[PDB]
Symmetry: C5
Subunit: 206 residues, 5 copies
């Protein structure tokens, strides 16, 4: 019972009292993808639909505390709406992302945050060769829409997409799936933007 | 009578979810109402069902004698904490087919029974045979591990007593089973109730 | 401004109810006007209807004396500004699509009327629709969370209003009835009330 | 510049900080349709989809002001949500209307308001004969859902639907399109309701 | 540095913009980046595009001195925190779908840049797409409610940016131009400004 009034004393003290990153306050977001399924490939429009979850990690000094003086709370679940989250976007989506999981994140006492939204995405992809041995290869990069490498940097823990939850009876078998940090330039802006590029080769099952 | 109830609600409302120190057990039961569609071009199947959810909070307890012998009441689910029970292998956002209103009883227990339509990952191969198709989908808290939310069932049988009698697909069997599993994000295990459905096309 | 200010003052007073109970129960009267059977899907056994649903109920908490409020006898209000019953179609397969403005009318005796137009997909096997005998389907409506002890349902007629049915629909209506029923549900000991809409239809000749 | 926006921000504050029409204080709404396109005709469901915009004009004494007491301001743009708007609805839609334009109205100093939303509407319509020289004919009426002829009256400026912006390469050519005020009874209510009936004759382009 | 920023945004927002007037007009620069022609429907004559709409404008009310806010020169903010122009496609057939965060960048001289990604269905007869010559379609963009006297438009170039066009699209772009036009509409005596996007395209191979 005391435990609950310690948490709401913490949540109140952190929240009731962060404008996003700046070049003076740069931030690094670690990204990693777990591909659950390739649902559909449309060769009349060259759209492919993926189901996956995107693990996101970042850290802020604004959210730090000392467990010692909050009944030894080390972390808490909270709405993603109640905290700053990064605007990590797919570059070649052809439809708005459909969110498949609760929008709840976990804040740890070192100020570190973790969010793992599950999503359905339609993206630009030519499935030619998916009915052949070689299969088809498509790619899609993910990055902050409005924050350049000076404000938001990206990182991965591995270049292999997690395939351990891939749906074993999908219409499409995964032949490879990698995730790789890149740096590119864009017409709007002198400054470079960071992406993590998701490349997947796939073909029709047996 | 009415004054008692509007006093009770304002008293009870004016809980930050479960913690390791204060865990919660949620009881789950499924009632399968219809297998609407089986798509063999994308391997997706669409179900209409209820998700019975039961849990209990000390913070929602009261003495009926102090509130005109009121023992329970209806409230919007938005007025109370509800569990983030999610299908692991959905391919589209869940569509809610019923009012989201729960019932709280004086012992702090809550019952909530939403109707939903879910598209999930399922290969219907064999649905046009005697032996039918078989698919599974597991349900659980997205963000709470077994240390914060535990699950249980009262029965391993999915309720088929209202299943639509003229559906395109007849149900051969449907079971609900609690499992424990690990996920890459986290060292703590997460609990699920796995729904396994066997079905085929109607005569 | 004098009748305008009398209405501001009235809506203030009334709006500034925890739903029905066993002690303070409620009767909702329902009627359906079927405008169209839009689509029958025999690959999924789903049929789509367009109709409007007249709802009536009465709260003592919405009563006022017109003499105290400039002889105002009734007013239009947003459905969100008042309590509305949770009348739900039992066998829907998609969320209900609202086709009309969500505005109710409250009268000085506390009665309320609300008449939402809706597109509904519900579970229906349309087999026989291409024969002289036609197809037959049913969908029942009722409170999701209130039993017969908290909400009762009534109809004025068992005939669905077909006077606005689309004359050039793909589907011709052989009959349409609306019938009050009392039934038990697994969740609960106490029976719930429904109004059962039974439509009989065939492909246009 | 600064001053004229000081006066505008004043006016809006003063006007915004009306319960709809009553029998004692009824309102006349003028309606006019501009048909942009017949997008689709579905003879499997007898539904037709139109894109059009709906000109709405009405006048309120509560929105009246003196231009001379507010820096010679004679009108302003405002969010359609910041004011009362009429609940004009199609009687035979088969799907919720989709709004294709910003929801912004213009209020003039005499209390008059104009609002011209673009919409896509599916409504009940048997396209039988769209592939003949005579074409198909369909009708849909528009009116206040909850206000009778005692509360809201409807009028048109012309019985001709504006076809000057009809899409020249539509799948369907317009033979005629008219808008006509009618009076009718409905089961719910002893009071008659007003509608403007839009009658369109069309055929396949060839 | 955090403090200065949260001091600025606070200063700019909770202490003042009512949109443009005839007395205080605004010029918006528009540029399009065509990403993909996704679909061409010859049964309904609709074509779906994915594109950016680069928008620039400038407000005196959004100006500040960097020396009074720790030499801050710009900042990111949600599109909802500020006024944005109501730039609309004239001939869309469905509501626009937003594909990117709605976040803008404000600079100390009061200038704003906003680059939303969108998918649009618009009116387009794709006859000829299966030929060497291809199909031609056009769609104009402008303020829905502001005339040339309130909002003017300009382009930075006649060339639609094709440098990110999807290389394996079903349709290859033959040309794409963006041209400012002036037009009168039935509602209003004043002329309304548009930027007209004209795209020539054909099936790939
Ligand atoms: C750079 N950005 C790209 C998208 C890009 O962020 C991206 C890169 C990789 C993966 C996803 C998105 C497309 C056009 C929009 C711009 C960012 C942008 O919107 C902006 C706005 C105002 C000032 C400065 C920048
Ligand atoms: C564990 N979880 C699974 C979903 C899982 O909760 C589940 C299990 C069974 C049935 C449905 C969902 C997918 C990936 C996301 C993680 C949980 C998760 O989102 C999280 C976020 C921050 C900190 C700790 C955990
Ligand atoms: C009884 N009810 C039916 C729906 C039922 O209300 C109904 C009846 C006729 C027509 C439509 C709906 C489906 C399963 C859910 C339950 C109501 C229900 O959700 C509930 C929740 C907590 C305590 C007691 C009851
Ligand atoms: C009159 N109305 C018609 C629609 C009608 O307004 C209409 C007429 C022409 C074109 C469109 C709609 C359908 C059924 C609903 C009723 C009005 C209505 O909703 C109501 C509600 C409470 C009290 C009194 C009236
Ligand atoms: C002029 N306008 C056009 C749209 C037009 O702004 C446009 C032009 C080019 C490209 C897109 C939109 C269609 C009909 C609506 C009117 C503007 C309009 O809605 C209005 C409303 C009240 C008072 C004055 C004007």
């Amino acid at each position: 019972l005391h435990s609950q009034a310690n948490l709401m004393r913490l949540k109140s003290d952190l929240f009731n009292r962060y404008p996003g990153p700046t070049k003076d306050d740069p931030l690094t977001v670690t990204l990693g993808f777990t591909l659950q399924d390739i649902v559909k490939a449309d060769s009349s429009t060259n759209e492919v639909d993926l189901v996956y979850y995107e693990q996101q990690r970042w850290k802020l000094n604004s959210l730090m505390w000392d467990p010692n003086e909050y009944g030894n709370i080390t972390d808490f679940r909270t709405s993603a709406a109640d905290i700053w989250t990064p605007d990590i976007t797919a570059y070649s989506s052809t439809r708005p992302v459909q969110v498949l999981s609760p929008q709840i994140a976990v804040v740890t006492h070192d100020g570190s945050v973790m969010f793992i939204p599950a999503q359905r995405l339609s993206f630009m992809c030519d499935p030619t060769g998916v009915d052949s041995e070689e299969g088809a290869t498509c790619a899609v990069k993910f990055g902050s829409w409005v924050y350049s490498g000076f404000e938001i940097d990206l990182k991965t823990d591995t270049d292999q997409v997690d395939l351990s939850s891939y749906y074993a009876s999908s219409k499409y078998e995964i032949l490879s799936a990698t995730q790789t940090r890149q740096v590119q330039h864009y017409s709007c802006c002198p400054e470079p933007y960071i992406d993590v590029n998701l490349v997947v080769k796939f073909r029709e099952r047996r």
